Amino acid sequence: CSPPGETASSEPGTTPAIWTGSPSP
Amino acid sequence: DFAKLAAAQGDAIDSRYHPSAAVRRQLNKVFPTHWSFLLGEIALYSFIILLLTGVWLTLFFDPSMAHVTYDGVYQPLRGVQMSRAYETALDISFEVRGGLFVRQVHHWAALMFAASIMVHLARIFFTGAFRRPREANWVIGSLLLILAMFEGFFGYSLPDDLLSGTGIRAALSGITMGIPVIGTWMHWALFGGDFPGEILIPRLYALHILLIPGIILALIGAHLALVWFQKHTQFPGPGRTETNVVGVRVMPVFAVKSGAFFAMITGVLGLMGGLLTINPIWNLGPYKPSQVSAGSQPDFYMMWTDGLIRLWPAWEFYPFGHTIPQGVWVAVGMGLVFALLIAYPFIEKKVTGDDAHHNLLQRPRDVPVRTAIGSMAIALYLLLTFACMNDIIALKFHISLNATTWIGRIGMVVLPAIVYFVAYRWAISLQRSDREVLEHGVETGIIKRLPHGAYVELHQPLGPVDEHGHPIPLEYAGAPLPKRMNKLGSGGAPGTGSFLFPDPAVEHEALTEAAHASEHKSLTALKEHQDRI
Amino acid sequence: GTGIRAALSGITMGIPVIGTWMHWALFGGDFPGEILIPRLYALHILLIPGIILALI
Amino acid sequence: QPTDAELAEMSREELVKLGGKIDGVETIFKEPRWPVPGTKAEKRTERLVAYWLMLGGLSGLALLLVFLFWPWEYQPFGSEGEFLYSLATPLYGLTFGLSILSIGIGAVLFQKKFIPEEISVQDRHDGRSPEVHRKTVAANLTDALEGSTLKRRKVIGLSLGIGLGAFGAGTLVAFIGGLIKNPWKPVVPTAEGKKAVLWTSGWTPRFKGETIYLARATGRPGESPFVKMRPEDIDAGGMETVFPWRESDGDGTTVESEHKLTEIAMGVRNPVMLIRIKPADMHRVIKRKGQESFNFGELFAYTKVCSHLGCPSSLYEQQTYRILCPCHQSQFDALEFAKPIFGPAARALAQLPITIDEDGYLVANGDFVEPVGPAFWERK
Amino acid sequence: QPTDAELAEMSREELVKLGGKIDGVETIFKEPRWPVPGTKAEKRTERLVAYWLMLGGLSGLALLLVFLFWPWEYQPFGSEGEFLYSLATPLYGLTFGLSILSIGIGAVLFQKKFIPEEISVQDRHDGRSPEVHRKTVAANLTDALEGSTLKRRKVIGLSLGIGLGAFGAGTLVAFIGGLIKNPWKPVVPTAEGKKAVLWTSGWTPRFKGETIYLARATGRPGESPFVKMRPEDIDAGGMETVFPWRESDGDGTTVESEHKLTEIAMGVRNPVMLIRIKPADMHRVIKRKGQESFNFGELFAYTKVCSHLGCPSSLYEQQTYRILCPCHQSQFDALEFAKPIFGPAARALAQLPITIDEDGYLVANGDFVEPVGPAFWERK
Ligand SMILES: [C]C([C])=[C][C][C]/C([C])=[C]/[C][C]/C([C])=[C]/[C][C]/C([C])=[C]/[C][C]/C([C])=[C]/[C][C]/C([C])=[C]/[C][C]/C([C])=[C]/[C][C]/C([C])=[C]/[C][C]/C([C])=[C]/[C]C1=C([C])C(=O)[C@]23=C(C1=O)C1=C4C56(=[C]2)[C@]2([C])=C35([C]/[C]=C(\[C])[C][C]/[C]=C(\[C])[C][C]/[C]=C(\[C])[C][C]/[C]=C(\[C])[C][C]/[C]=C(\[C])[C][C]/[C]=C(\[C])[C][C]/[C]=C(\[C])[C][C]/[C]=C(\[C])[C][C][C]=C([C])[C])[C@]1(=O)C461=C([C]=[C][C]=[C]1)C2=O
Ligand SMILES: [C]C([C])=[C][C][C]/C([C])=[C]/[C][C]/C([C])=[C]/[C][C]/C([C])=[C]/[C][C]/C([C])=[C]/[C][C]/C([C])=[C]/[C][C]/C([C])=[C]/[C][C]/C([C])=[C]/[C][C]/C([C])=[C]/[C]C1=C([C])C(=O)[C@]23=C(C1=O)C1=C4C56(=[C]2)[C@]2([C])=C35([C]/[C]=C(\[C])[C][C]/[C]=C(\[C])[C][C]/[C]=C(\[C])[C][C]/[C]=C(\[C])[C][C]/[C]=C(\[C])[C][C]/[C]=C(\[C])[C][C]/[C]=C(\[C])[C][C]/[C]=C(\[C])[C][C][C]=C([C])[C])[C@]1(=O)C461=C([C]=[C][C]=[C]1)C2=O
Ligand SMILES: CCCCCCCCCCC(=O)OC[C@H]1O[C@H](O[C@@H]2[C@H](O)[C@@H](O)[C@H](O)[C@@H](O[C@H]3O[C@H](CO[C@H]4O[C@H](CO[C@H]5O[C@H](CO)[C@@H](O)[C@H](O)[C@@H]5O[C@H]5O[C@H](CO)[C@@H](O)[C@H](O)[C@@H]5O)[C@@H](O)[C@H](O)[C@@H]4O)[C@@H](O)[C@H](O)[C@@H]3O)[C@@H]2OP(=O)(O)OC[C@@H](COC(=O)CCCCCCCC[C@H](C)CC)OC(=O)CCCCCCCCCC)[C@@H](O)[C@@H](O)[C@@H]1O
Ligand SMILES: CCCCCCCCCCCCCCCC(=O)O[C@H](COC(=O)CCCCCCC[C@@H](C)CCCCCCCCC)COP(=O)(O)O[C@H]1[C@H](O)[C@H](O)[C@@H](O)[C@@H](O)[C@@H]1O
Ligand code: HEM
Ligand code: HEM
Ligand SMILES: CCCCCCCCCCCCCC(=O)O[C@H](COC(=O)CCCCCCCCCCC)COP(=O)(O)O
Ligand code: FES
Ligand code: FES
C-alpha cells in the first residue's frame, strides 16, 4: 500500500517570508 | 604416606556419606567416542570461559548512561562527552593491565559459543538425535540457542559505542515500537520512555550478567542431566544395538579426553584473544544519535535477522488511520523461525508417523528428505547472513549494492529450492555408492590386463566369496563402508625407529607382532559380542 | 556511606604491611573513588549470591 | 553377591570386573599400550609427551614474566613506545594460549599412547521402568490425593483455586505494574499545550513565534558546540547536519547550558540534513503537497532520521541526489521530496520548513507537518 | 519381588505398603481424620478451612484493586494528597501479606484436619557402605591410576606438575594483576613535587605562597557553594566547617568550576573544624610542640576527620570544649591540641595553621604538619 498522506503536488510554492520571531520564552 | 592418606580420606568420606555405589556408577558410565559427540562440549567450555572472563569484567564496568567528559589516557577521545559505560569500557581496555586481553577473550568466546551451538545443532538434526525419547532435550537446546543469541546481543550493546548503539536504535527500539497495538507500550516498558533514555544500559547489564546467564545455566544443567541419565545415542556399527552403549568408561579415558579438550579449546580462545582484534571500541567513538558509520553489521549470530530486514520489501499497510510498518514482517518472521525450530521433532513425527524409541543414529545420507530440508535451511541462513554483509561485499568484491539486494531477494526463494534438490539427489547418490561396495567389494585401483585383452580392476571383498570368486553381496547395516584399501591396512607400516634412525630389527618385529595381535583381539571381542547378542 | 568509610575503608587501610595495598586494590585508589559502588553491586547481585546458592 | 571373605581374596582385576557387572558394564577389550617392555619406541613416546608438557610449562612461565615486565601502558600515536605497546596484548594471548594449548596436547597424547585401549559395553535399561516401580509410585501418588479427601470437598477446592488465582493475579500485576508506562501521556511543553513524546522533537515550538536556529556542530565539546549558520556557508552540492538551537540554550559554558546542549545533541528526532541543490537542477525538483514553500530557494531541509527504522540516513550523493541509509540500504530521492526509491523504506523523509531571519541566519519556518522517525501503530 | 499378574491383583493399600518396604519405610500408624461420617463437626471444620482460603482470595483481589486504583504518587509536605499517599505502601503490604498468609493458614489447617495422621519409620542405611561397593569402587580407581602407568613415568609426572603449576601461576597473576595498585605512587602535584595520595589533601599547597582560603559552605548546590569568611563571622563558642578553597576554582557557574568544587566537597581529608574559644578560657589552652603559633588568637582549626577511623568527629561541646565523634565515641580535648581523652582514638586531631590576609579573610598559614585521618602501617 502507499502512504495516504504522501502525494506529489504541481503547485509551485512561494519564497518564504523573513522570520521575525515573537518574544516571551 | 601418599597412599595411606588416600585410604584414610576415602574411608572418612565413605563412613560419613557412603557414596561408594553411586560414585562407582558414575565411573563405569560408558560414552561413545565419536568425534562429532564432542561438539556439545565446545559450547559448554565456551560458556565456562564466558563466565570466568565475565566475572572478571564486572569488577571494572560501570553501566551508567550518565554523561561525562573523558579524562583517560586515550588521546584521540580526550574531552569527548560519553556515557560512563563507554568510559569504563575504555578504562578496561587501556587502564587495567590485561583488560583488553580479557575483553577480547570474552568476545571471541561468545562467538565460539554461538558457532558451537549452531554446529552441534546441525549434528543433532542431521543424525536424528532429537527423536524420542529425546524431544524435550531438543526443545531445551533450542531455547539455549535463542537465549545465547540475545545474551550476546545485550553483551555487546553494553559499552554504548556508536556501532552497537546504532544496532540498539534500529533493532531493539525501531522494530519494537513498530509492533501493532502493543508496540509502543513494549518500547516504553523496556526503555522507560523514548529511546535512548537513562535506564537502558543498566537494565541490559542486569539482564546480561545475572538474569539471562542464570536461566542459561539452569537450562544447561537440565540439558546435561538429561543427556547423562538418558544415555547418549550412538551410530550403528559392530556390536551396537538399540539397547546398549559402546564406547569407553568415564574413568579414566573419557575424563582425560574431556579435560584435554577443555584445555585445548581454552588455548585456541586464548590465542585468538591475543592475536586478533575484536570490537576495538575506541575506534568507533561513543554513541550519538546524529552519527553513523557505513557497515552496521551485528555479531554474526544476529546477522540473519538483520539480513531479513535488508531483504524484505517495503510492504506496509495503513488501515483506518493506523500504520503497520515493514519491520513487523521481520518480527513475525523471527517468531515463525523460532517456532519452527522448537517444534521440529513433533512436526516430523506427525509427518513420518514414526513414534518409536530410537537410540541408534541415522547417517545423514540415509534420511534424504531431512538432509535436504536441513541443507535448504542452512542455505537460507547463509543467504540471510551474507545479505547482512552485502555492503561490505559490494565494497570489497565490486558488486552493485542494489544488485546485492536483488540477488538476496531472488536467491531467498531460488537458492533453498536448488539446494534442496541437489542435497536430496546427493544423499541418494551416496546411498548408491555404498551399495556398489556392498555388491562388488572395494575397488583397489589396480588394473590388470587379461590374456585375451580385457581390463579388470581388482576388488577386495568385504565378506565371503563364491567358487567363481565373486563376493557374496552384503546387506547394508546403517554403517559406513570402507572405500580405500589403505584404510583397511594395505599400506602396512614404515618401520620402527625415530624419524631419522631405525630401531633394532628385533624391537620392530616384536612391536609389529604385538600391534597385529592386539588389533585382532579387539576385532574378535567386538565380533563375539555381536555374535552373542 | 559513613559505615563504608569507617569499616570497609578505615579498618582495611590500617592492616599492617598490606593494609593500604588491600585498600587500593578494593577501592581502586583512595576512598571513595569512582569504582566502589559498581564493584559492590557486581559482588552483591551476582557473585556472592551465586556462592551462597551453591553452598545452600 | 559375594561375601566379605570372598572379596578379600579377589584380585584388583576381578574386583573391577565385578564392579562393572553390578553397574551393567562389560569391558570386552582392554590391553596395555606396551606389551613388549624395554623398547626405544616407548622411551621416545614418553619423551614426546614430556616435551609437550614442558612447552606448556615454559609458556606459562613466559606468561608470568611478560605480564609483570612487558611495557603494557598505552603509548600515543607516533611515540617511541607505541610499537612495544602494540604487542602487549598479543604476547599475553600467545603465552597464555600456547601454555594451556600445549598441556592439552600433552594430555591427549598420554591418553592415546599410554592409557590402555578399551572397549566397554553398557546396557541402557531404558524405556518404561519395571512394572513394580510404576505401580508403586502411582499407588503412592493416588493414595496421597485420595487419602487427603480433597476431591470430595468442593468448597475447599474451589476456595483454594480462587484464592491462589487471586493472589497470583495481584502479585503478578504488582510485580510488573511499575514497568508499565503510557506512551501517550502528554509530558512535552509545546506552543499548544502538553503533547506525547513521539509527536514532538527539538523543532517543536515551545511558544508561538519562537526562533529556532539551524545550528551546526563545531566538534569541540563545550565551548559553543553549536553555532548559527548562514545560507552562503554551504556550497551547491554540499550537505550539513543541523540541530535545533535557541538563544536561551547558550554556549555551554554554564552547567545548565551544557545540560541543554547535551539534550539537543542526544535528541533522537533532532538531526536535520540541509542540502543545497545545484541551480541547474532546480527544474527537476518535485514538491510534496503541503510542502511547496518549505525550501529557501535552493536550500532544502529533511530529517536525518530514516523513516524505516531510525538510523541516520546520511549518505548524501550530490550528483544522483540520493540519500542512502547505511543500515538497511534505503534510498530517498532528494529532488522528489525525499521519497523512497529503494530498500525497505515505504515513507518519505519529513521536510523541515526553513527561512532566514533579519540577520540572515537560517532558522526554521515552523515545525515538521508529520511525525518524524520510524512509524508505529498509532501514526497517521 | 512380586510378578506382573500379582501386581495387577493388588489393592492400592498393598501397593503403597510394598513401595514403602522397597524404600525402607514402614507406615506404622495411618488413620483417617473422620472415621464417623455425617457429623456436624466435619462440616464446620470444612467451612473453617474454606473461610481462611476465601479470606486469602478476597485479600489478593484487594491487592490487585489497590495496586491499580489507589493514589500511589508522592505528594509534598502539607498538600491535600499527602495523607492518602502515606497509606499507599502500607496497603500494598497489608493486602499482599494478608492474602498469602491466609492461604498458608488454610493449608496448615487442611493438613491437620483432613489429611490422615501418620507415623512412618524409615531406616538409615548410613555409616560405611557395604564392603562390595567399597572394594569395587576402590578397585576401579586404583586400576585407573595403575593401568595409566603414570606412577612410573617420572619425567611425565614432573613435567605435568611443573607445567600445570606454571600455567596456574601465570593465569592467577594475570587475573588479579590488574587490580593491584601501588598506594605510594606519586600522583598528586604539590609545591615540592609529586606525592602519594595519603600524604596530601586539599590543604597541600600546589605552589609556594599559594593562598588557600577557609571557605564556608552556603548550602546552595549550584551558585557559590563555598565563600570566604572573616574572624568576626563566628562568635565565641561557635564552630564552623571550612573547606580549602582557591580563588582559581571559582563559584561553580562554569562546568570546570563545578567539577573543581565537587572535588573540594568530596575530598576525604578536606573538612576542617574552626572553633572560636571564649577569651576567659584562653589561659586553659595547652599547645602542642611544633604548633604553638597555629592559632589566630582565639581561633583554632583542627581536622574534622577523626584519627581513629575517619568519621567526621564534629560533635562540638562548647562548654566542655569536647569534640565527640559519633561513630565510636572518641573524645578530643580542644583546649589540649585535640588530644584524645576517651574512646578508641589514640592520636590527636591534626591542627591546621591559620591566619588572615590583607583583606581580613581567614586563610591557611601552611599545611598540616602530620598526615590527616586514620593511621596506616606506613605512618610516622
Ligand atoms: C487449579 C489449582 C490447583 C489452583 C490454581 C491457582 C492458581 C492458578 C494460582 C495463581 C498464583 C500464581 C501463579 C502466582 C504467581 C505470582 C507471580 C507471577 C509473581 C512473581 C513474578 C515474577 C516475574 C517472578 C519471577 C522472577 C524470577 C526469575 C525469580 C527467580 C526465582 C527462583 C529462580 C527461585 C528458585 C527457588 C528454588 C530453586 C528453591 C528450591 C527449594 C528446595 C529445593 C527446597 C526443598 C527442601 C530440601 C532440598 C530439603 O532437603 C529439606 C527441606 C526442603 O524444603 C525442608 C526440610 C528439610 C530438608 C530437609 C532436607 C528439608 C528440605 C526438604 C525439602 C523442602 C525438599 C522438597 C523438594 C521437592 C518437593 C522435590 C520435588 C521435585 C520435583 C517434582 C521436580 C519436578 C521437576 C520439574 C517439572 C522441573 C521443571 C522446570 C522447569 C519448567 C524449568 C523452568 C526454567 C526456568 C525459567 C529457570 C529460571 C531460573 C532462574 C531465574 C535462575 C536460577 C538459576 C539457578 C539457581 C542455577 C541452578 C542450575 C543448575 C541446577 C545447574 C527440610 O525442610 C527439613 C528436613 C528435616 C526436618 C525438618 C525440615 C530435611 O531433612
Ligand atoms: C601435583 C599435581 C598433580 C599437579 C599440580 C599442578 C598445579 C598445582 C596446577 C596449578 C594451576 C592452577 C591451579 C591454576 C588456576 C588458575 C586461576 C586461579 C585462574 C582463575 C582465577 C579466578 C579468581 C577465577 C575464579 C572466579 C570464579 C568464581 C569463576 C566461576 C567459575 C565457575 C563457577 C565455573 C563452573 C564450571 C562448572 C560448574 C562446570 C561443570 C561442567 C560439567 C559438570 C560437565 C560434565 C559433563 C556432563 C555433565 C555430561 O553429561 C557430558 C559431558 C561433560 O563434560 C561430556 C560429554 C557428554 C556428556 C555427556 C553427558 C557428556 C558430559 C560429561 C561430563 C563431562 C561429566 C563429567 C563429570 C564429572 C567428572 C563428575 C565428577 C564428580 C565429582 C568427583 C564431584 C566431586 C565433589 C566435590 C569435591 C565438590 C567440592 C566443591 C567445592 C570445594 C565447593 C567450592 C565452592 C565454591 C567457591 C563455589 C563458587 C561458585 C560460584 C562462583 C557460582 C556458581 C554457582 C552456580 C552455578 C549455582 C549452582 C548451585 C547449585 C547446584 C544449587 C559429554 O561430554 C559427552 C557425552 C556423550 C558423547 C560425547 C560427549 C555425554 O553423554
Ligand atoms: C486486538 C488487536 C487487533 C487490532 C484491532 C484492535 C485495536 C483497534 C481500535 C483502536 C486502537 O488502536 O486502540 C489501541 C491504541 O489505543 C491508544 O491509541 C489511541 C488511537 O488509536 C491512536 O491512534 C491515537 O494516536 C492515540 O492518541 C494519542 O495521540 C493523539 C493524536 O493522534 C492523532 O493525530 C496524529 C498526528 O497528528 C497530530 O500529531 C500530533 C498530535 O498532537 C501534533 O503534532 C498535532 O496535533 C497533529 O495534528 C494536526 O492535525 C491537523 C493537520 O491536518 C491540524 O489540526 C493541525 O495542523 C495539527 O497539527 C495521528 O498520527 C494519529 O493517528 C491520530 O489521528 C492525541 O490526541 C492523544 O492525546 C494521544 O497522545 C489514542 O490514544 P488515547 O486517546 O490516549 O487512549 C484511548 C484508549 C484506546 O481506545 C480503545 O479503543 C481501546 C480498546 C481497543 C484496543 C484493544 C484493547 C482492549 C482489548 C482487551 C484489553 C484484551 C483482553 O486507550 C487504551 O485504552 C489503550 C490500552 C492499551 C492496549 C491493550 C491491548 C491488549 C493487551 C494484550 C495484547 C494508545 O493506547 C495506543 O497505544 C493503542 O494501541
Ligand atoms: C616481581 C613482582 C611479582 C613477583 C611474582 C609473584 C607476585 C605477583 C602476584 C600479584 C601480581 C601483580 C601484578 C600486577 C601489576 C603490579 O605488580 O603492579 C605494580 C605494583 O608493584 C608491585 O611490585 C606489586 C607487588 C604485589 C603486592 C601484593 C599486594 C597485597 C594484597 C593484599 C593486595 C590484594 C589482592 C587480592 C588478594 C587478597 C586476599 C585477602 C584474603 C605497579 O604498580 P603501579 O604501576 O602503581 O599500578 C598499576 C596500575 O596503575 C594499572 O592500572 C594496573 O592496575 C597495573 O599496571 C598496576 O600495577
Ligand atoms: C548452550 C547450548 C548447548 C550446549 C552447551 C549443549 C551441550 C550438549 C552436550 C555436551 C551434549 C552431549 C554431547 C554431544 O552429543 O555432543 C548435548 C547433547 C544434546 N544436545 Fe545439546 N547443547 C546445547 C544446545 C543444543 C541444541 C541447540 C540442541 C538442538 C536443538 C541440542 C540438543 C541436544 C540433544 C538432543 C542432545 C543429546 C544427543 C545425543 O544423545 O546424542 N542441544 N548437548
Ligand atoms: C552466554 C554468555 C555470554 C555471552 C554470549 C556474552 C557476550 C558478551 C559480549 C559479546 C560482550 C561484548 C564484549 C566486548 O566488549 O567486546 C559482553 C560484554 C560484557 N559481558 Fe558478557 N557474555 C556472556 C556472559 C557473561 C557473564 C556471565 C558475565 C558476568 C559475569 C558477563 C559480563 C560482561 C560484562 C561486564 C561486559 C561489559 C564489559 C565489556 O564490554 O567489556 N558476560 N558479553
Ligand atoms: C576426593 C578426596 C579424597 C580422595 C581419595 C579417595 C579415593 C581413594 C580411596 C580408595 C582407593 C584406594 C583403596 C582404598 O583406600 O580402599 C579403601 C578406601 O576406599 C573406600 O573403601 C571408599 C572410597 C570411596 C570414596 C571415593 C569418592 C570420591 C573419590 C574419587 C577421587 C578421584 C580402604 O581400604 P581398606 O579399608 O584398608 O581395605
Ligand atoms: S534504518 Fe534506514 S533503511 Fe533501515
Ligand atoms: S571514627 Fe571517630 S571514634 Fe571511630
UniProtKB/TrEMBL annotation, chain A:
Name under which the protein is recorded: Superoxide dismutase [Cu-Zn]
Function: Destroys radicals which are normally produced within the cells and which are toxic to biological systems. May play a role in favoring mycobacterial survival in phagocytes.
Residue range from the parent sequence: 21 to 45 of 236
Gene source species: Mycolicibacterium smegmatis (strain ATCC 700084 / mc(2)155)
Similarity field: Belongs to the Cu-Zn superoxide dismutase family.
From TrEMBL, chain B:
Entry keyword Cell membrane: yes
Gene Ontology biological process terms, A to Z: respiratory electron transport chain
Enzyme class: translocase
Chain positions recorded as heme b 3 binding sites: R103, H106, H107, H208, N279
Any one GO cellular component localisation term in the record: plasma membrane
Transmembrane intervals: 35-61, 105-126, 138-158, 170-192, 204-229, 259-278, 327-347, 367-386, 406-427
Entry's Gene Ontology molecular function annotations: metal ion binding; oxidoreductase activity; quinol-cytochrome-c reductase activity
Positions that bind heme b 1: G40, H120, R123, R134, H223, H232, T233
Annotated keywords: Cell membrane, Electron transport, Heme, Iron, Membrane, Metal-binding, Respiratory chain, Translocase, Transmembrane, Transmembrane helix, Transport
Catalysed transformations (reactions): a quinol + 2 Fe(III)-[cytochrome c](out) = a quinone + 2 Fe(II)-[cytochrome c](out) + 2 H(+)(out)
PROSITE patterns with a match to the protein in the record: CYTB_NTER
Sequence positions that bind heme b 2: G40, H120, R123, R134, H223, H232, T233
Pfam families on file: Cytochrom_B_N_2
InterPro entries referenced in this protein's UniProt entry, alphabetically: Cyt_b/b6_N, Cytb/b6-like_sf, Di-haem_cyt_TM
EC number(s) stated in the UniProt entry for this protein: 7.1.1.8
Membrane topology of this protein: Multi-pass membrane protein
Required cofactor names: heme
Location of this chain's protein in the cell: Cell membrane
Function recorded in the entry: Cytochrome b subunit of the cytochrome bc1 complex, an essential component of the respiratory electron transport chain required for ATP synthesis. The bc1 complex catalyzes the oxidation of ubiquinol and the reduction of cytochrome c in the respiratory chain. The bc1 complex operates through a Q-cycle mechanism that couples electron transfer to generation of the proton gradient that drives ATP synthesis. The cytochrome b subunit contains two ubiquinol reactive sites: the oxidation (QP) site and the reduction (QN) site.
Quaternary data: The cytochrome bc1 complex is composed of a cytochrome b (QcrB), the Rieske iron-sulfur protein (QcrA) and a diheme cytochrome c (QcrC) subunit.
Name of this chain's protein: Cytochrome bc1 complex cytochrome b subunit
From TrEMBL, chains D, E:
An annotated Gene Ontology molecular function: monooxygenase activity
Main subcellular localisation: membrane
Protein topology in the membrane: Multi-pass membrane protein
Regions that span the bilayer: 49-70, 90-110, 155-180
Signal peptide (residue range): none
Keyword Iron among UniProt keywords: yes
Record: residues binding [2Fe-2S] cluster 2: H308, C325, H328
Alphabetical list of Pfam families matching this protein: QcrA_N, Rieske
InterPro entries: QcrA_N (IPR045603), Rieske_2Fe-2S (IPR017941), Rieske_2Fe-2S_sf (IPR036922), Rieske_Fe-S_prot (IPR014349)
Binding site for [2Fe-2S] cluster 1: C306, H308, L309, C311, C325, H328, S330
Rieske domain segment(s): 269-363
PANTHER family, per the entry: CYTOCHROME B-C1 COMPLEX SUBUNIT RIESKE, MITOCHONDRIAL
Family: Belongs to the Rieske iron-sulfur protein family.
Name of the protein described by the UniProt record: Cytochrome bc1 complex Rieske iron-sulfur subunit
Native source organism of the sequence: Mycolicibacterium smegmatis (strain ATCC 700084 / mc(2)155)
Lineage: Bacteria, Bacillati, Actinomycetota, Actinomycetes, Mycobacteriales
